[PDB]
Ligand binder design. Structure first.
Ligand SMILES: C[C@@H]1CCC(O)=C(C(=O)SCCNC(=O)CCNC(=O)[C@H](O)C(C)(C)COP(=O)(O)OP(=O)(O)OC[C@H]2O[C@@H](n3cnc4c(N)ncnc43)[C@H](O)[C@@H]2OP(=O)(O)O)[C@@]12CCC(=O)O2
Ligand SMILES: C[C@@H]1CCC(O)=C(C(=O)SCCNC(=O)CCNC(=O)[C@H](O)C(C)(C)COP(=O)(O)OP(=O)(O)OC[C@H]2O[C@@H](n3cnc4c(N)ncnc43)[C@H](O)[C@@H]2OP(=O)(O)O)[C@@]12CCC(=O)O2
Lengths: 248, 295, 248, 295
């Protein structure tokens, strides 16, 4: 079995949801989407998933396909799900720092940015309410920086332990084209869990602005099972749309 | 002895607005925006607006005409590539608007507070984020008078009410009294925008008699009642170029043309000359011609 | 034209809504219901009315009849209407005091009543949010008492003028089988506006526990117009259900 | 690889409950109450309950068995004559239950706070009323951190979250995974009860496959999703004797018999012997026989 970099990324995105149970999986990019649907077809059948617009799917469809539905999830109800905590989102990111602060809003000063993106969207509500993970298709030092310009996703150094309003914050994984990471290093720092086959420690270090905890000892990302490869290649992403979103 | 006839034109409705108003705009991103009403705003001299919106090309067009002083929004998105609205981006990078950017759930919360005539509602979203810095002292916290079981009291964002001078929303079907319905998968928040506002204008694809309205859609789709609307505008294709539920999808090719036309002063004058210098009928004719040419 | 006591009560209940505009009329008894519908067919066409369950009526039907609908008003939405203020309710009452405190909850101590009724229902929310009026089909000193046992409807002596949360309180009318009253007497006291033809001041005084302001000078309730009599007798209440709810 | 099969019996569902729990009961008054689940509670030894409800004969039956210690409610009503529930009245006049009676809108508010994991939500309802005295220091106020325009700050009721150990609701149609729908004019608040609770049991008139469910009702009627339900009970006529939307109306004659049977120890033993001393099937057979006799 020859396994591509995007196929390792797909199974790593499925592993984001290991143990998630009966919660709403909300991937916001193609690789996490394949991953969430792969988890649903293997070890997490109770995940809820949507069409990204307003319909909850009964079955698990291929990327871009319709499937029979099981419920209704318009935007006003998504906010109820966020506030209930019964959700795990996978967001993209223009910047992520060593403690998990994240930016998808804009670059530069808040009232006069040098470049405009979406604004904060749902990132503040996601990060304060329920498990949040991140996907980065091109792992670089511009993404993984010392300080994010605008904190749209709340990192670990923002938490007030005296205020139980912060008790639901949990940043679970960062999956990139180079490996699998979390914030389990000392002081909740960015930590390497695995590197995809063919990725070296120095490749990660050279493309991260800060020190990655446990990088020297991080093993290699697991192999996909035969079933996972079949599901990725034949069922979920037969056109290999995943490759377009995974950089060297 | 009859209920009030609220039918008015696009220009009539904008004639009820005034510079300096806080205006909420319905829809979401590039979805069921009251684009005909926005074009009527562009034709008018109404400016210096404070806009509350889940932003899309509505906010972009208003920025292209310098009509926005302050903006409250959960995001600004075109939903399709190039995703970022280039006119909103230009106003931001030029420092032309003061922003009260907020978590998307805070918009809903603030509109709900206004709908209930409450000064705030508590919410977790915003805590620990740069939403605090966007707002400064305009956004305060509130502490629960009940501690949690452990004895610790939660301190939450006190989302202030997003009270509006006016709301502009577009729906699929309505009567001359303001009863109105959406068709398709999502009402968005148009009921909340109307409930949060003093003056409420709904444009609809078609005006029908009340009995036709209620026999066409399920009860649950009747999101506006007569107490929520002050003027009704019949505007077929009045959400173009955003999508509109069951009525039509997004005009993706035209939205791309809008975005690419914002790149140069030259491209924008031509877009204005062709699409934004006449009536709604002139716009609709030009949009139809564009679709035929680009096949 | 011979006009019955119930017919005077019906037009008085219509007059409750004079000037109401485009708000939800929520009568909670037969006479106020005839009154609200009579107002809608005469001088207040913009009133909203429901079937008392979940449907907003387009046309104005006879008592107990269906009519074509114009909207949806399930209970969860009624609470939104209450909080919006765009409503005028007409409630019944087991007790009403001189300042407009009202009880439909129970008699006796709060945690061990001597007689149980409905509990407070929506009376606290109604009286704090929007115009509230009352209907009493048998005006007696047990209803109009010095002190209500349980304050379910908020009266004027509960208002904190320093707290703008109280700024929407407004008790508009009390209509009974004896006359039309408000709380416009000195210190927001129960005040007579009119007595129905054939009712004397001493009849009211003998059936009210406290002094009624302006009782000696109160005139007689107006005559119904010919149109109002036609609408009451032919259109809205042809079976004279109103008579069952109006006592001597 | 399958989603969890949540189908369980009435007695199984009550077997997951425990004495001392706070339980929310769906429906409203004498409308779509989970009466089969309530009868299963009566058969069980589960007692010392704190009940949160828009009360009707559900609360009356629980009071008849001494199962209620504390009750949070916006009202108690049978909706038809004699209107007041006689078993709730007996428990009240005997001082057998501690009450946190509240404005009807406060129930919705408290359930919404729990659904959002918030410790309170502000509300006007309750201010100035004896709701304050029913609750004492369990009900506190909260002051807005934003004064109104005049400079005065509003102080509102801080409605505490109505967190529930369990919710019992009855709906018209559902699948074995907990997706469920109402038919008829009102969902009541059954979604909020489920969202506010730890353990959630829905009885339904009929269990169908998911695809049948979603093709039978509009999207907007799908008020429960799989994250809101832990057990599904198939209970045809499981709301009797309350109404149930499109499925059936209220059994007015039988509700009258229930109420009149509460008047004497003698009448109640006979009602218990005939209706409440066997299974749900025994109850349903006896109710059918009553209808035939009273024609
Ligand atoms: C309602 C619900 C509620 C629940 C929920 O959950 C929601 C969410 O929404 S959850 C959030 C989901 N949304 C995401 O997660 C999106 C994340 N975004 C992406 O995924 C992007 O696609 C990307 C990050 C992969 C690429 O972004 P990008 O294209 O903008 O930037 P990038 O490619 O990095 O190149 C960067 C370019 O800037 C240049 N530059 C870099 N520095 C600077 C600088 N100082 N100054 C000037 N320029 C700069 C650089 O030279 C490049 O220019 P250039 O190339 O050199 O010209 C919802 C739905 C809608 C809502 O509201 O709530
Ligand atoms: C959701 C929305 C929200 C918005 C909204 O707006 C809502 C409302 O709901 S808005 C409220 C609407 N609801 C009303 O407005 C109802 C008012 N009620 C009536 O209208 C009654 O029908 C009546 C008052 C006319 C008669 O009542 P009654 O029959 O109980 O008593 P009464 O006839 O006076 O005889 C009295 C008997 O007690 C005896 N007694 C008197 N003292 C005592 C004493 N100390 N101790 C012991 N006994 C006593 C006396 O000897 C008589 O016994 P007896 O005869 O001698 O045996 C909703 C809808 C549902 C909800 O929740 O919110």
């Amino acid at each position: 079995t020859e396994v591509t970099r995007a196929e390792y990324c797909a199974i790593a995105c499925a592993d984001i949801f290991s143990g998630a149970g009966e919660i709403m999986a909300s991937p916001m990019a193609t690789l996490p989407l394949i991953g969430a649907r792969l988890a649903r077809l293997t070890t997490e059948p109770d995940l809820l998933i949507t069409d990204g617009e307003a319909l909850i799917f009964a079955d698990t469809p291929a990327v871009g396909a319709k499937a029979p539905i099981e419920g209704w999830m318009p935007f006003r109800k998504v906010f109820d799900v966020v506030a209930s905590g019964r959700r795990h989102v996978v967001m993209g990111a223009n910047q992520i720092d060593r403690h998990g602060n994240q930016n998808l809003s804009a670059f530069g000063p808040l009232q006069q940015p040098t470049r405009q993106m979406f604004g904060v969207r749902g990132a503040p509500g996601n990060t304060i309410n329920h498990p949040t993970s991140y996907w980065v298709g091109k792992h670089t030092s511009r993404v993984f920086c010392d300080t994010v310009d605008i904190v749209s996703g709340v990192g670990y150094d923002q938490i007030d332990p005296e205020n139980p309003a912060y008790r639901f914050h949990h940043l679970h994984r960062v999956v990139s084209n180079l490996g699998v990471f979390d914030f389990g290093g000392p002081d909740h720092t960015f930590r390497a869990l695995s590197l995809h086959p063919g990725v070296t420690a120095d490749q990660v270090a050279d493309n991260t602005s800060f020190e990655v905890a446990g990088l020297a000892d991080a093993g290699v990302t697991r192999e996909p099972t035969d079933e996972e490869l079949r599901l990725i290649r034949e069922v979920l992403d037969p056109r290999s749309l995943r490759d377009r979103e995974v950089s060297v | 002895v009859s209920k009030r006839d609220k039918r008015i034109s696009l220009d009539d409705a904008v004639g009820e607005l005034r510079s300096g108003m806080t205006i909420g705009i319905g829809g979401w991103g590039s979805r069921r925006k009251p684009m005909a009403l926005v074009r009527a705003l562009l034709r008018s001299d109404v400016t210096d607006l404070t806009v509350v919106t889940y932003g899309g090309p509505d906010l972009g067009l208003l920025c292209s005409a310098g009509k926005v002083t302050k903006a409250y929004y959960g995001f600004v998105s075109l939903d399709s590539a190039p995703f970022y609205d280039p006119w909103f981006a230009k106003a931001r990078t030029a420092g032309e608007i003061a922003v009260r950017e907020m978590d998307a759930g805070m918009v809903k919360c603030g509109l709900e507070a206004a709908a209930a005539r409450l000064p705030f509602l508590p919410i977790r979203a915003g805590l620990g984020s740069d939403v605090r810095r966007f707002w400064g002292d305009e956004l305060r916290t509130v502490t629960s008078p009940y501690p949690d079981a452990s004895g610790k009291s939660e301190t939450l964002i006190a989302m202030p009410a997003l009270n509006l001078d006016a709301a502009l929303v577009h729906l699929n079907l309505g009567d001359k009294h303001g009863n109105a319905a959406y068709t398709g998968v999502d009402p968005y928040f148009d009921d909340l925008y109307c409930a949060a506002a003093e003056k409420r204008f709904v444009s609809v694809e078609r005006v029908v008699e009340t009995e036709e309205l209620v026999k066409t859609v399920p009860l649950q789709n009747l999101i506006l009642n007569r107490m929520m609307v002050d003027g009704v505008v019949e505007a077929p294709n009045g959400a173009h170029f955003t999508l509109a539920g069951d009525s039509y999808g997004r005009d993706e090719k035209f939205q791309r043309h809008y975005a690419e036309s914002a790149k140069t002063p030259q491209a924008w004058q031509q877009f204005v000359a062709t699409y934004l210098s006449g009536s709604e009928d002139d716009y609709q004719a030009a949009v139809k011609k564009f679709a035929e040419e680009q096949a």
